[model samples]
Target: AGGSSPITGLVYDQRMMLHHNMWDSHHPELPQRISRIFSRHEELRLLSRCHRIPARLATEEELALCHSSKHISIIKSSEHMKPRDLNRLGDEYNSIFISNESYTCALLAAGSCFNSAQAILTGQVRNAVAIVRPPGHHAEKDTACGFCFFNTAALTARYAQSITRESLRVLIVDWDVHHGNGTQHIFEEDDSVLYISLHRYEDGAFFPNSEDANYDKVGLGKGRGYNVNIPWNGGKMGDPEYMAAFHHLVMPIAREFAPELVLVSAGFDAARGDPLGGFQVTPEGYAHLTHQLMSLAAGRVLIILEGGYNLTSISESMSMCTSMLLGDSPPSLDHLTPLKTSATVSINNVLRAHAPFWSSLR
Candidate 1:
């Protein structure tokens, strides 16, 4: 498959830019997060190469896949709220900010994920990427936090399984600098959707700070050992550390799970020069990771946009992954160094904790 192959699907909607912090313009999660990335796609001509998947508003019934009715109503009410009211509601949660248009944008962001999954499952595309805002993975069942009003990946995973009459196991790989505490909690009691996150834990010092992000908190009940967390204590983890995790933990279990669909919570905050992430992963590193995941589930991967704050870093990293999805070769990482001590320890703990459950680890 070369230039003639339009196997990859792309999802983007300009309306998501309307969801912003009405009270604060300098918030780390900015409209440019999606806007700049889309613009880069235009500049690189990546937009014209793939099939564009149109985004639609997620119905309350579809949103009900992972969210509570009360939560849906709360978000729905935000559409008519005054700036003061919106700010007051935001204060009720951690790191949340909303504008009147937030409700509509959140629906579109989530719907984009569902449509991406639909495109892959229906064989409309081999793989796809949803470039959305008000990034999910931080939003929970009944509450919103971390600049996220809806759990996009979690909802997509649940929706993917529900729409299928056959048995379907889904894998969620979150590479954000911050742990996807919401996504993990939502799927912690279920075995069908495997949640794996690699983030800056720093012993609960990171945002969405929770001991639950630790490597030992695999899963509960039937979901036991399905949740895998690669918590990084050192703030400087980079390309080598991530590659080591995939080689040692991610791929082994992923192959064993052999999911019918793979979903990635693609967050570029861990990229080099991100102020909040304090890590050093590069655009090339992201492309390599995307390429590796494309081998799973017969290459039916849908990448859902998650956290990544820096404008230049997120755009560059996302563009590289998009290029990879478009069948372009990524720059070679010929001189990668060894993993950090903390990363080594973290990977070991994850392996030991999950060994009993996964045959690949045993």
Candidate 2:
């Protein structure tokens, strides 16, 4: 597929920028995360390589697929309130902020993911990128935290399975700087979807800080050995560390799992120079990573936005990812090194933990 081939599906709705209304307060997880990336979208020539897909607002029934009715009910009443009241409720919850327009925006935010998944499931595009805001990985079944109101990635995975009558097994690889606690919780007990996250875990000290995202938190009974977390103990993790985790642990399990589609909780926060996530991954590094995953599921990968504050980094990183998915060759990786001590330890522990379940790890 050349220029007419349409290698990537682009999902961006103007409504995503609307619900991020903060009522005159500054927050890292604001709508500008998308506004900037998209403004730079054409400058980086991403539009030419992608076919735009309209994002639809998620209905109550669609949101109910992965979220609790109680949680969904709360958000319905929560966002229309004043910012202060929302904060009071946010404090009651963990880290949540619901703007009056956030409910609609959040629906659209999640809608983008489902739209992208549809684009890929119907063979309209090779892979898809849903650039949405009010990031979803932090949102839980019954609560909202980390600037998330709904689990977008989880919704997309389940929606994909539902369209096919629960026949597709999805692999969700979250490389966000922050661990996706919400996504993990949703899929922890299910075998149809595999959730893998590589994040900067300062040992229960990071935001949403806790030991719940630790290495030993593998899947429960029927879903054992499916949930994989690469917690970077001593921060400053870089390309080498991430690539090592992929080769040693991620790839082996990926091959063994053999997913029908791959959905990435795509976050650029781990890129160099982010205040929240101080990792050293470059834009090219993201391209390399996407290339590796493209080898799976016959190149049917859907990327849903989660986190990433820096505009320049997010733009470059996302552009690189789209380029690779559009069939462009990534740059040489002479910059990569052998695994770091932390990565090796994490990989070894993960292999040991999942050995009883997967022969690939054996």
lDDT winner: 1
Worst 10 residues of 1 by lDDT: 1-10
lDDT of 1 at 277: 85
Model 2 reaches what TM-score against the true structure?
A: 0.95
With a 3 Å backbone cut-off (N, CA, C), the pairs that clash in candidate 1 are: none
TM-score per prediction, in order, is 0.97, 0.95
Candidate 2 wrong stretches, greater than 4 Å: 1-6, 21-24, 337-339
> Per-residue lDDT tens digits of candidate 2, residues 1-362?
55556468888877788765455456777677887888777897878768888988999999998888998888899766776787676667776666678889889988888888888888888798888888889888888888888999999999999887686899999999999999999999999999999888888898679797888999897888889988888758888888888898888899899988999999999998777898899888898899999999888999777889888899888888888888898887657666677777777888888788889878
Q: Give one digit per residue, the lDDT tens place, for model 1 in 316-352.
A: 8998888888778778996687767878888989988
Tell me the whole-model lDDT of each prediction, alpha carbons only.
0.89, 0.85
Instruction: Tell me the spans in candidate 1 whose CA falls farther than 4 Å from its real position.
Output: 1-6
lDDT of 1: 0.89
RMSD of 2: 2.0
229 Cα displacement, candidate 1 (Å): 0.6
